[PDB]
Design a protein around this ligand. Sequence first.
Ligand SMILES: Cc1cc2c(nc3c(=O)[nH]c(=O)nc-3n2C[C@H](O)[C@H](O)[C@H](O)COP(=O)(O)OP(=O)(O)OC[C@H]2O[C@@H](n3cnc4c(N)ncnc43)[C@H](O)[C@@H]2O)c(O)c1C
Ligand SMILES: NC(=O)c1ccc[n+]([C@@H]2O[C@H](COP(=O)([O-])OP(=O)(O)OC[C@H]3O[C@@H](n4cnc5c(N)ncnc54)[C@H](O)[C@@H]3O)[C@@H](O)[C@H]2O)c1
Length: 367
Amino acid sequence: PHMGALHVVIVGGGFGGIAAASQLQALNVPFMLVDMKDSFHHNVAALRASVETGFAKKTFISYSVTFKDNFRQGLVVGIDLKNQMVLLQGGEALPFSHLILATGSTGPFPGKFNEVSSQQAAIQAYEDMVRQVQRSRFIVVVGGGSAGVEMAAEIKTEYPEKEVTLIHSQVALADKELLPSVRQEVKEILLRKGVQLLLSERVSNLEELPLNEYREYIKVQTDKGTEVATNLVILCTGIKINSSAYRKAFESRLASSGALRVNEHLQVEGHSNVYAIGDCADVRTPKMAYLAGLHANIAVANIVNSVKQRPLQAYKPGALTFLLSMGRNDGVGQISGFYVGRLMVRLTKSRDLFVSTSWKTMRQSPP
Ligand SMILES: Cc1cc2c(nc3c(=O)[nH]c(=O)nc-3n2C[C@H](O)[C@H](O)[C@H](O)COP(=O)(O)OP(=O)(O)OC[C@H]2O[C@@H](n3cnc4c(N)ncnc43)[C@H](O)[C@@H]2O)c(O)c1C
Ligand SMILES: NC(=O)c1ccc[n+]([C@@H]2O[C@H](COP(=O)([O-])OP(=O)(O)OC[C@H]3O[C@@H](n4cnc5c(N)ncnc54)[C@H](O)[C@@H]3O)[C@@H](O)[C@H]2O)c1
């Protein structure tokens, strides 16, 4: 029983969650941010952190330094809707008047890092990854979605002398939703960088492969009988909505995606005090970090606007913005539905990978 008082709980400390937490902190609204890690992960830069020595420490930002007693590390195992509690592993419970679900996506390392561990262990996992890439003359990237084409491009840009093969199950690279001109340019850039492309092939012995580790010899097989000898296998095979925290409680209002259905105010269907932001919300746009932060502004604003009996802010998508960095010197993509070239993408994304915007949000300075 909050007896009218606000206490917001944010489940997930990603791009959406740290934006929500930062705004709630500036409004002096009581809240608790929950994340399984001890630091925010700027995962847009996770592939650069897999190939550049010393870079990983720029991609993890301590929660407690920024949020102090408004942060609690923990693993959310469920949501008790009748008694308005967030259920943590270990048995602890967090009461809320409003709930913001910002649980993001899960997938293979290095592109995603969803482990309970300390900031130094997380940084070391990416430094270890860099050392496996450095030891490995021959490298296979599996999956030619937008992550795989970035992974392969990063390796060949930092290490032109390595042999890199990208194996992709479709005939075209990167998102089906992209302008065809963008998808063709991605292909032409990988080929000009010397990446060997095996298109329309599915790697078929994934269970038998050592992953993210150098070996003197690894044989990759595909369903068409192609065999590739390599020293290192990196998986960029896709991601899944991380419905872990809320799956049982909200099974009624889940999309196929695993996301939560929401109106244009980002309240979860059937609720007025539960919001979903970022990857876990069921919007028609693609899963983007910058959209996560914009949903965060909308959700917090609507919590306040609901208390002030004011009209709620509305989320209105426009045409697709999607930028692919192709190593630090190259890239291609589209901004609001039209093509942008390699100089533009290099300057906007490939050089810094938006890293400074997260340190600014967290009001910390990178080491
Ligand atoms: C992999 C990748 C992604 C890119 C890339 N580029 C861009 C880009 O240029 N622009 C962009 O907007 N998005 C880009 N993205 C997408 C961006 O990474 C994601 O869209 C973004 O992370 C989504 O932000 P969310 O806030 O929705 O989710 P996160 O995954 O960031 O965070 C969720 C958090 O919840 C925590 N969590 C989840 N379930 C939990 C539970 N049960 N208990 C506790 N904590 C939990 C997780 O540990 C994690 O900390 C990119 O180059 C790469 C290589
Ligand atoms: N630059 C950006 O904006 C950016 C970059 C990365 C990711 N993202 C976001 O994350 C989402 C996921 O992207 P992603 O690339 O991680 O996944 P994805 O699902 O877009 O691509 C993974 C691909 O790997 C293929 N694959 C799976 N197993 C395979 C196998 N054994 N052999 C060969 N191919 C195999 C899949 O069929 C799929 O085409 C994007 O749709 C977007 O929302 C954005």
